[PDB]
Write a protein that binds this ligand. Structure first.
Ligand code: CLA
Ligand code: CLA
Ligand code: CLA
Ligand code: CLA
Ligand code: CLA
Ligand code: CLA
Ligand code: II0
Ligand code: II0
Ligand code: II0
Ligand code: II0
Ligand code: IHT
Ligand code: WVN
Lengths: 175, 175, 180
């Protein structure tokens, strides 16, 4: 049996079609050494943070909250323009949200599905076909947001502006 | 008949769908779901029939609460931002409710709908079966025509900048 | 169900006072239902006091306050009394007094809301406060829903009153009397 993603390599033994974004892609066999379900949970959390981060790098191009209206549209400067009381409140809120993952991982590790923090308020994923599609879509949009945020971060390092601004001014290359 | 007699007829295009003249050279329906493609074709078609009606009407009529653009495509740019956003969310509401909150190719057809049916016949024009067959063919062909026509009307209005009927009554070749 | 489109989660039991199938956003899946019920009863009662006080602070005012408060309406009175207390004024400590006693009351009634979640006998919101005995001696249960309905209405009404003031200096009676 060979891997779907890299057809000339053998299939990575510890990933399976059961996993939503499975492509058979583990050329360096991380799952051969680390727990596949731990890696699965880490990829989903990184994707969820990145999906918000990719929207966050883009969104104050359009509109800013009135209090932070004076803040810069380059995200890497608006990071330092926020007060430490504000960053402390963000860190506390992320801490409160992360207590549930600290309780899921490290205590009931084997009970559930990777990334399942009991957050389904609109009762989606009830229909099985919808649940299948949403599982794969969350993984794929999370991976895309990881790549996209990685891009936009380094683009803000080179051109000292945000994504849309760099595009509009056509500042695509190191000046 | 075969639309492209030199090419072999596509294998999945059986005559059951209306408007089938065996025209799929590029080779869709060999990769994608024909239910999805047909529902997409009717959606594009019905949108474009309303779109060409909108272009022709807005070239003449204007609601008193709205400004008037030079052309019906410049009519988009004098309607308040909130108005465009309200129409967008209203259409989104329709798209959610009419499709049973199942909007992706993985789940849109998992309840067994036929492509393009929303149970929409208040006047009961589809009461007759054979008349329904004829109007199915009429709908898909007028929809295809309105797709092309909308492309033509929009690009000519962008190019000349003088409407559709005004363009015809004041035709001025490319110089 | 309140919304045929989006019904209430199964987390919500249907035996609670004021259950009308309304939770389209699934907010009872995101927290303890006992905590949420307790929180809405407390919000209801605080808002009922706030709304009745907003109306009363317009129709009739307690003696002497016009020298300490002038003609400020509902949001303004809070800020102006705290302004006067910011100097050393003795006769402007109504805010500190109410804050002290409500904080003391919430401090000593604090274990109650944790006993209810822990499986305790007391139901959400019940402090057994029935001095007149009217609700107790008579069959009780209609008064619960009357409390919840008036409390929800009071929350929306406070919202209205405050924001109507934040736009126009009229209070409740002045804003209702005319129509700018
Ligand atoms: C629930 C019914 C409802 C209600 C109460 C309204 C109310 C309103 N609409 Mg209408 N609208 C509706 C449904 C509704 N809409 C639907 C279903 C459609 C699509 C078929 C539209 C399409 C539409 C257009 C095309 C326009 C409006 C505009 C307006 C607003 C004019 C205000 C103004 O001049 O200064 C207010 C000025 C502002 C800058 C504030 C923004 C306007 C607020 C946010 C309106 C909020 C309405 C609310 C979100 C309901 C929409 C629900 C959604 C499903 C459509 C007014 C509040 C006009 C507008 O907003 O111009 C400004 C406008 O051009 N509407
Ligand atoms: C419990 C509710 C609550 C309350 C009362 C406040 C109150 C406040 N927030 Mg906080 N905030 C909250 C929840 C709350 N926030 C939550 C849930 C988040 C999400 C993480 C934030 C994120 C946040 C940021 C990012 C900032 C504030 C800031 C502020 C302050 C405004 C600036 C000021 O007074 O000087 C004010 C004290 C600002 C601040 O502290 O400036 C000094 C600021 O920049 N807030
Ligand atoms: C919130 C809005 C919303 C949502 C959730 C949907 C949802 C859907 N649409 Mg619809 N659509 C919308 C708005 C929306 N639509 C509008 C405004 C138009 C133009 C009138 C269309 C035209 C349209 C066509 C022609 C087709 C779909 C299709 C689909 C499905 C595929 C999902 C997808 O990839 O697109 C999800 C889409 C979005 C998240 C946003 C759509 C916005 C598009 C790009 C239109 C952009 C605006 C337009 C150019 C100008 C409108 C001006 C007006 C607001 C005044 C899904 C049922 C396809 C389908 O069902 O066939 C299989 C299809 O063929 N849509
Ligand atoms: C959220 C509640 C709230 C808040 C913050 C305020 C705050 C204020 N009020 Mg308003 N007021 C309220 C409720 C409130 N009031 C209610 C419910 C009423 C009666 C309808 C009034 C009637 C009122 C008048 C007539 C006046 C004020 C005034 C004032 C100011 C001075 C303090 C004072 O004398 O209070 C007076 C408040 C009371 C006498 C309220 C007592 C009602 C209690 C809560 C009933 C409790 C029943 C029960 C036995 C208790 C349950 C026990 C159980 C928990 C164990 C201050 C801004 C004065 C001012 O300067 O405004 C211009 C003023 O003239 N208030
Ligand atoms: C239970 C509520 C209550 C009651 C019965 C009274 C009763 C009275 N107040 Mg008022 N007062 C109240 C609450 C109340 N006050 C509140 C909540 C405040 C603000 C925190 C004030 C601030 C106030 C001032 C500043 C003064 C009075 C004064 C007076 C007394 C004279 C009447 C007058 O000048 O007109 C009168 C007995 C006056 C006084 O003591 O004169 C003898 C006076 O100068 N009052
Ligand atoms: C619409 C008002 C309303 C109603 C119907 C209830 C009903 C109830 N309450 Mg609740 N409560 C309310 C308001 C109300 N409450 C407010 C505002 C407070 C905060 C002080 C409380 C605090 C409270 C506690 C702490 C407890 C209750 C309890 C109870 C229950 C048994 C007691 C009983 O039957 O008294 C019936 C009460 C009334 C009929 C209210 C009398 C209102 C009178 C008729 C008029 C109010 C005048 C007011 C000052 C405003 C004047 C108008 C203004 C514009 C000038 C019952 C569900 C107890 C419980 O759940 O367990 C037994 C309990 O422990 N309540
Ligand atoms: C879970 C849950 C629900 C929910 C929910 C929520 C809040 C869901 C939120 C979903 C979000 C925020 C998804 C965002 C994904 C972003 C992506 C894929 C961006 C990638 C960027 C890219 C590719 C880029 C780029 C760029 C590059 C690098 C170069 C640049 O010069 C330019 C460019 C811009 C092109 C609800 C509440 C409905 C209830 C339900 O019961 C349960
Ligand atoms: C389903 C349903 C019903 C319904 C309904 C509705 C609302 C039906 C609406 C149907 C419509 C609006 C059909 C429109 C078709 C337009 C076409 C084919 C394009 C024409 C233009 C062309 C060819 C051109 C051109 C040109 C180009 C490009 C450039 C120009 O310089 C020149 C030129 C002008 C020559 C109802 C409500 C009755 C009830 C029923 O129970 C259920
Ligand atoms: C088949 C089918 C049917 C049908 C049908 C119909 C009516 C089909 C008709 C289709 C038509 C008329 C298509 C016309 C396309 C025009 C194009 C692509 C030109 C683009 C211009 C460009 C790119 C440019 C440019 C340039 C610019 C502006 C600057 C200048 O320097 C010049 C330059 C030129 C270089 C129906 C509906 C009955 C259904 C049926 O079951 C099957
Ligand atoms: C429990 C119990 C006891 C007790 C007790 C107590 C203290 C009972 C008190 C009960 C109270 C205070 C109920 C008040 C509810 C207020 C409402 C519903 C207002 C809604 C506002 C609206 C709709 C509005 C408005 C608008 C207008 C008009 C003005 C505009 O400018 C603004 C706007 C347009 C928004 C006793 C002592 C009996 C013993 C007993 O044994 C146990
Ligand atoms: C005095 C004091 C302060 C203060 C303060 C306060 C108390 C500020 C007030 C805050 C409040 C209570 C805001 C209310 C929000 C409720 C809303 C918007 C209703 C939503 C319901 C909707 C949209 C629909 C409901 C519905 C309808 C139509 C019927 C169908 C069902 C449904 C769809 C559910 C300051 C800040 C001034 C500072 C000062 O130093 C001290
Ligand atoms: C296949 C076929 C078979 C046999 C016959 C045949 C003729 C030989 C052949 C046909 C061939 C051909 C060549 C057919 C030709 C097909 C073509 C080129 C169609 C072009 C379509 C373009 C459209 C609809 C643009 C839409 C833009 C929009 C809506 C922008 C909107 C905008 C938004 C919202 C934001 C900005 C504001 C505006 C600007 C308003």
């Amino acid at each position: 049996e060979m891997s779907e993603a890299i057809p000339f390599m053998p299939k990575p033994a510890n990933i399976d079609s059961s996993m939503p974004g499975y492509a058979g892609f583990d050329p360096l066999g991380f799952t051969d050494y680390y727990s596949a379900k731990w890696m699965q949970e880490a990829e989903i959390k990184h994707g969820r943070v990145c999906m918000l981060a990719a929207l966050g790098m883009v969104f104050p191009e359009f509109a800013k909250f009135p209090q932070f209206a004076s803040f810069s549209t380059n995200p890497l400067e608006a990071f330092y323009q926020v007060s430490p009381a504000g960053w402390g409140q963000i860190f506390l809120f992320i801490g409160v949200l992360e207590t549930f993952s600290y309780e899921k991982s490290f205590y009931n590790f084997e009970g559930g599905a990777p990334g399942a923090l009991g957050f389904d308020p609109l009762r989606m994923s009830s229909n099985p076909a919808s649940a299948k599609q949403y599982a794969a879509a969350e993984v794929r949009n999370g991976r895309l947001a990881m790549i996209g945020f990685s891009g936009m971060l380094h683009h803000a390092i080179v051109s000292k502006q945000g994504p849309i601004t760099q595009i509009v001014e056509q500042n695509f290359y190191p000046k | 008949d075969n639309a492209m007699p030199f090419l072999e007829r596509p294998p999945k295009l059986d005559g059951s769908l209306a408007g089938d003249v065996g025209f799929d050279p590029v080779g869709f329906s060999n990769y994608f779901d024909l239910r999805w493609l047909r529902e997409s074709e009717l959606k594009h078609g019905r949108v474009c029939m309303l779109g060409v009606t909108g272009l022709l009407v807005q070239e003449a009529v204007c609601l008193p609460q709205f400004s008037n653009g030079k052309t019906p495509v410049d009519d988009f740019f004098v309607v308040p931002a909130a108005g465009l956003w309200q129409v967008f969310f209203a259409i989104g509401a329709v798209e959610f409710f009419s499709h049973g909150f199942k909007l992706t190719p993985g789940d849109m057809f998992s309840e067994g709908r036929e492509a393009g049916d929303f149970g929409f016949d208040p006047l009961g024009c589809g009461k007759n079966p054979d008349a329904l067959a004829r109007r199915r063919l009429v709908e898909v062909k007028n929809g295809r025509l309105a797709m092309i026509a909308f492309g033509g009307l929009l690009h000519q209005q962008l190019l000349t900048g003088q409407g559709t009927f005004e363009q015809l009554a004041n035709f001025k070749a490319i110089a | 169900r309140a919304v045929p489109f989006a019904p209430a989660p199964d987390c919500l039991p249907e035996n609670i006072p004021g259950y009308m199938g309304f939770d389209p956003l699934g907010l009872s899946t995101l927290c303890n239902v006992e905590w949420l019920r307790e929180a809405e009863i407390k919000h209801c009662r605080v808002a009922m006091l706030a709304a009745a006080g907003s109306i009363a602070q317009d129709l009739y005012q307690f003696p002497g306050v016009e020298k300490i408060v002038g003609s400020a309406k509902m949001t303004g009175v809070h800020d102006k009394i705290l302004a006067a207390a910011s100097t050393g004024d003795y006769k402007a400590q109504a805010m500190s007094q109410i804050l002290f006693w409500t904080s003391f009351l919430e401090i000593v009634t604090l274990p109650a809301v944790f006993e209810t979640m822990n499986g305790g006998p007391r139901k959400p919101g019940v402090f057994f406060f029935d001095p007149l005995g009217l609700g107790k001696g008579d069959k009780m249960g209609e008064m619960e829903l009357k409390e919840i309905k008036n409390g929800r209405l009071a929350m929306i009404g406070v919202g209205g009153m405050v924001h109507h003031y934040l736009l126009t200096g009229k209070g409740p009676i002045q804003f209702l009397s005319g129509i700018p």
